[PDB]
């Protein structure tokens, strides 16, 4: 078997560090650095913890690897932007895989994979489809912000690219920053957009055409002479433009000592909800641009299957509108469409070059660490909390959810990507018309306007959803059928749209059993499934992380491995 370790993350100005290990084309392990370090977004680091976990999980050392692959062409970026690539392969490996954590006798072959090739590999090779059009829409790779390519016969061939100064991902991050949501939280902008109305989707900046878009605000060949990407140049141009054309100036961040918290805390000067029409208009602009790019690559390649990756591929609202287009029959977007996926993509590209066949992802993203009952018990015994070991944990959790309680669920291998998918989730009733406000305001103390989404059995999804297909990742919106347009108020929008996870018995037996039991109580085997964290931390990974979060949030119960902990309500 070939064993290839893919990596993302570097100590200089990088984000989304992660590591993925392919063994004979199968995902043996995959983790994001932030989940193990507890530092959101995996900034400015090699993926030391994630790679250490992957090797441990597989029972390997670096000497057992056939290759190490990195999801950017770093030598090219250093040569073009920083005056030269100074590292031998051995020196680069010492930075990526420091010897104090990764002892080795010799160096594995090191491969640098062009960033958009890594994104494209993370979609195509794991899709279960033998051919299709590839659309990569990113912030920026080494140079380009968009790649259109043709995936066929195991090969990916580039058709066209768009230069970085025209980035749709940077545009959307800059609007998110302008509204006060923050450029690091573009998912919040997508949720805010649902509450606004679009006036003029060009924003007096875009011109749209049947193949995509033009941006008249900035020279497409603009390059920052003092940086290695175009983010600061695009930021300056977009902030100036938005202040000219939109009725509100930028929201500002405010840092003030809060005596209730005993710390300086960051807030915004205005409520970001005031910018909802800008959010709606930016989302409409993004959608129209991407519809053109998607139509273009499908038409050029003669395909009707669309593979999307790059960070903009996390835009589930946009993805759902692509799926319904007359030009698209099938679509695949991996849960790791953002830069966290280029570790996996780089490993895949290299594994394919080495002659392996890559297995489909298969309706799960559960590749991170898991913990045995003894390991969970060790973490529980640290807290001193009382707990139970239910004879039928799934049936008890279903009854708690049916009654309107919120249950933390930490089971099996951690899912990868930004969405909880029944491995590290907070669960609540899909049928309750008060549950959305309860979890947004009482549990998470976040914005009232944030949406929630459901998990449901794949075996009922053809009845619940208008499309009979797998939706394993909560990465694509669709509509419910009439019979469910009012029954599921916490997880279905007024317009009947929803962003589902379908669950198969093979994908997640425990979660499947719990939803089955819940269906016997509330009629539909469907629940609300949100991230097990709050706004200030990554999704929990270890049993100790789950207990720490459980203890600070007014959650009713925690099902962690085979154990059930309930809030200590004795005065
Ligand atoms: Fe990217
Ligand atoms: K203005
Ligand atoms: K369609
Ligand atoms: K208790």
CA 245–ligand 2 middle distance (angstroms): 5
93 plus 127 within the same structural domain: no
CA 422–ligand 2 middle distance (angstroms): 45
Closest ligand by atom to 246 CA:
2
3-state secondary structure of 305: strand
**Helix, strand and coil percent figures for the chain, each rounded to 5:** 35, 20, 45
* Strand ranges (E), 289-373: 305-309, 330-332
Beta bridge partners of 266: 255
193 plus 95 within the same structural domain: no
Burial class (CB in 10 A: 0-12, 13-18, 19+), 473: buried
99 plus 122 within the same structural domain: no
What length does the chain have? Answer: 571
Tokens of 447: 């914005």
Element (H, E) at 407: strand 407-410
455 plus 481 within the same structural domain: yes
455 is known to lie in a ligand binding site: no
Burial class (CB in 10 A: 0-12, 13-18, 19+), 223: middle
CA 88–ligand 1 middle distance (angstroms): 25
341 is known to lie in a ligand binding site: no
162 plus 293 within the same structural domain: yes
Q: 170 in a domain, yes or no?
A: yes
Resolution (A): 1.6
Show the DSSP H helices in 210-332 as ranges.
Answer: 231-245, 276-301, 316-323
* Strand ranges (E), 33-166: 67-70, 110-112, 131-137, 144-152, 155-163
Q: How far apart are CA 165 and CA 175, in angstroms?
A: 15
Closest ligand by atom to 467 CA:
3
518 plus 412 within the same structural domain: yes
Sheet of strand 3-8, all strands in order from the earlier edge strand to the far edge: 26-32, 18-23, 3-8, 67-70, 110-112
Burial class (CB in 10 A: 0-12, 13-18, 19+), 238: buried
The angle formed by the CA atoms of residues 452, 458 and 460, to the nearest 5 degrees, is 90
Q: 335 in a domain, yes or no?
A: yes
Residues 168 and 208 sit within 8 Å (Cβ to Cβ) = no
3-state secondary structure of 428: strand
List C-alpha distances in Å: 501 to 363, 396, 476: 9, 22, 9
Q: How far apart are CA 155 and CA 153, in angstroms?
A: 6
Q: Which residues surround ligand 3, an ion (CB under 5 A)?
A: 328
CA 23–ligand 3 middle distance (angstroms): 35
Closest ligand by atom to 278 CA:
2
227 is known to lie in a ligand binding site: no
Tokens of 169: 């991902």
176 plus 69 within the same structural domain: no
CATH code of the domain containing 303: 3.30.420.40
57 is known to lie in a ligand binding site: no
Query: Which residue has 């992802």 as its token pair?
Result: 361
3-state secondary structure of 248: coil
Residue after which a domain boundary falls, among 332, 361, 390: 361
Residue after which a domain boundary falls, among 329, 361, 393: 361
334 plus 387 within the same structural domain: no
Letter string b/e over residues 87-108, b meaning 16 or more CB atoms within 10 A of that residue's CB: eeeeebbeebbeeeebeeeebb
209 plus 330 within the same structural domain: yes
List C-alpha distances in Å: 569 to 19, 402, 432, 483, 557: 41, 20, 24, 39, 11
Residue 116 among the catalytic residues: no
List C-alpha distances in Å: 309 to 39, 149, 471: 24, 12, 16
420 is known to lie in a ligand binding site: yes
Catalytic residue among 15, 111, 150, 174: 15
Beta bridge partners of 235: none
Element (H, E) at 499: none
Closest ligand by atom to 295 CA:
3
3-state secondary structure of 192: helix
Contacts for 392 with CB less than 8 Å, ≥ 6 apart: none
Strands 305-309, 330-332: parallel, antiparallel or unpaired by DSSP?
Answer: parallel
Q: How far apart are CA 187 and CA 433, in angstroms?
A: 24
For residue 73, count other CB atoms closer than 10 A to its CB: 21
List C-alpha distances in Å: 359 to 126, 130, 346, 365: 6, 11, 15, 13
292 plus 389 within the same structural domain: no
Contacts for 26 with CB less than 8 Å, ≥ 6 apart: 359
311 is known to lie in a ligand binding site: yes
440 is known to lie in a ligand binding site: no
267 plus 354 within the same structural domain: no
Burial class (CB in 10 A: 0-12, 13-18, 19+), 48: buried
Residue after which a domain boundary falls, among 361, 389, 420: 361
**Tally of domains in the chain:** 3
Rg (CA), the chain: 23
Beta bridge partners of 501: 455
3-state secondary structure of 152: strand
Q: How far apart are CA 25 and CA 158, in angstroms?
A: 23
Q: 232 in a domain, yes or no?
A: yes
List C-alpha distances in Å: 211 to 283, 300, 312: 18, 10, 18
CATH code of the domain containing 376: 3.90.870.20
Element (H, E) at 47: none
Q: 123 in a domain, yes or no?
A: yes
Q: 571 in a domain, yes or no?
A: no
- Method used to determine the 3D structure: X-ray
List C-alpha distances in Å: 315 to 3, 57, 61, 305: 32, 31, 37, 18
Q: How far apart are CA 19 and CA 215, in angstroms?
A: 35
3-state secondary structure of 296: helix
CA 385–ligand 4 middle distance (angstroms): 7
Q: 424 in a domain, yes or no?
A: yes
57 plus 134 within the same structural domain: no
Instruction: Please provide residue 14's backbone torsions phi and psi, each rounded to the nearest 5 degrees.
Output: -130, 160
Question: What's the domain range around 547?
Answer: 362-566
Q: How far apart are CA 134 and CA 322, in angstroms?
A: 13
Long-range Cβ pairs for the range 87-92 (8 Å, 24+)? none
- Report the sign of the C-alpha dihedral through residues 249, 253, 255, 259, in that order: positive
List C-alpha distances in Å: 385 to 146, 201, 389: 51, 54, 13
CA 249–ligand 2 middle distance (angstroms): 7
Q: How far apart are CA 427 and CA 405, in angstroms?
A: 8
Closest CA to 428 of 416, 415, 444, 413: 444
Q: How far apart are the first and last CA of the chain?
A: 58
Show the DSSP H helices in 411-536 as ranges.
Answer: 435-437, 458-464, 509-522
Q: How far apart are CA 3 and CA 475, in angstroms?
A: 29
List C-alpha distances in Å: 301 to 92, 134, 152, 253, 345: 38, 9, 10, 46, 22
Tokens of 428: 């609540």
392 is known to lie in a ligand binding site: no
Closest ligand by atom to 327 CA:
3
CA 442–ligand 4 middle distance (angstroms): 20
List C-alpha distances in Å: 228 to 12, 74, 77, 82, 400: 11, 11, 7, 7, 52
CA 569–ligand 4 middle distance (angstroms): 6
Q: What crossing angle do the helices spanning 316-323 and 276-301 adopt, rounded to 10°?
A: 40
Write the secondary structure of 202-227 as one string of H (helix), E (strand) and C (coil).
CCCCEEEECCEEEECCCCCCCCCCCC
């Amino acid at each position: 078997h070939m064993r290839v370790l893919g990596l993302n993350g570097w100590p200089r100005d990088f984000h989304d560090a992660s590591a993925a290990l392919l063994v004979d084309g199968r995902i043996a392990a995959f983790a994001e650095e932030e989940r193990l370090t507890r530092k959101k977004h995996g900034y400015n680091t090699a993926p030391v913890q994630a790679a250490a976990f992957c090797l441990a999980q597989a029972g390997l050392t670096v000497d057992d690897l056939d290759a190490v692959a990195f999801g950017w062409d770093l030598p090219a970026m250093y040569r073009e932007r920083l005056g030269g690539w100074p590292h031998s392969d051995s020196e680069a490996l010492d930075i990526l895989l420091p010897r104090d954590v990764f002892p080795r006798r010799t160096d594995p072959p090191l491969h640098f994979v062009q960033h958009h090739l890594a994104h494209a590999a993370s979609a195509y090779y794991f899709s279960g489809e033998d051919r299709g059009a590839v659309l990569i829409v990113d912030g920026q790779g080494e140079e380009e912000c968009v790649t259109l390519a043709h995936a066929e016969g195991g090969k990916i061939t580039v058709l066209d690219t768009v230069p970085g100064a025209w980035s749709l991902g940077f545009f959307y991050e800059h609007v998110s920053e302008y509204t006060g949501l923050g450029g690091d939280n573009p998912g919040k902008l997508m949720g805010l957009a649902a509450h606004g109305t679009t006036v003029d989707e060009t924003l007096s900046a875009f011109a749209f055409d049947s193949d995509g878009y033009r941006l008249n605000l900035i020279d497409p060949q603009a390059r920052d002479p003092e940086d290695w990407d175009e983010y600061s140049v695009t930021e300056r141009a977009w902030f100036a433009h938005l202040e000219r054309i939109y009725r509100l100036p930028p929201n500002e961040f405010v840092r003030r000592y809060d005596p209730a918290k005993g710390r300086v805390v960051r807030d915004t000067r205005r409520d970001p909800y005031e910018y909802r029409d800008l959010a709606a208009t930016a989302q409409a602009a993004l959608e129209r641009a991407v519809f053109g790019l998607a139509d273009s690559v499908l038409a050029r390649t003669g395909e009707r299957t669309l593979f999307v990756a790059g960070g903009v591929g996390l835009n589930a609202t946009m993805n759902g509108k692509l799926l319904t287009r007359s030009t698209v029959d099938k679509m695949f977007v991996p849960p790791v469409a953002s830069d966290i996926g280029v570790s996996l993509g780089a490993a895949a590209a290299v594994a394919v070059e080495l002659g392996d066949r890559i297995a489909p992802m298969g309706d799960t993203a559960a590749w991170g660490p898991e913990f045995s009952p003894d390991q969970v018990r060790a973490a529980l015994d640290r807290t001193g909390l009382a707990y139970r070991e239910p004879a039928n944990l799934e049936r008890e959790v279903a009854a708690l959810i049916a009654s309107g309680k919120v249950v933390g669920w930490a089971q099996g291998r951690g899912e990868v990507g930004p969405r909880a998918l029944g491995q590290r989730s907070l669960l609540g009733s899909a049928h309750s018309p008060t549950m959305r406000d309860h979890i947004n305001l009482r549990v998470k103390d976040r914005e009232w306007w944030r949406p929630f989404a459901p998990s449901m059995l794949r075996s009922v999804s053809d009845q619940v959803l208008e499309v009979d297909a797998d939706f394993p990742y909560m990465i694509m919106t669709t509509k419910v059928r009439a019979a469910y347009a009012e029954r599921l108020p916490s997880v279905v929008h007024e317009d009947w749209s929803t962003r589902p996870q379908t669950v198969t018995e093979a994908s997640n037996p425990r979660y499947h059993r719990m939803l089955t039991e819940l269906g016997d109580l509330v009629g539909d085997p469907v629940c609300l499934n949100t991230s097990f964290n709050d706004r200030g931390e990554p999704i929990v990974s270890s049993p100790a992380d789950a207990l720490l979060t459980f203890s600070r949030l007014p959650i009713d119960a925690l099902a962690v491995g085979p154990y059930l902990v309930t809030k200590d309500l004795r005065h």
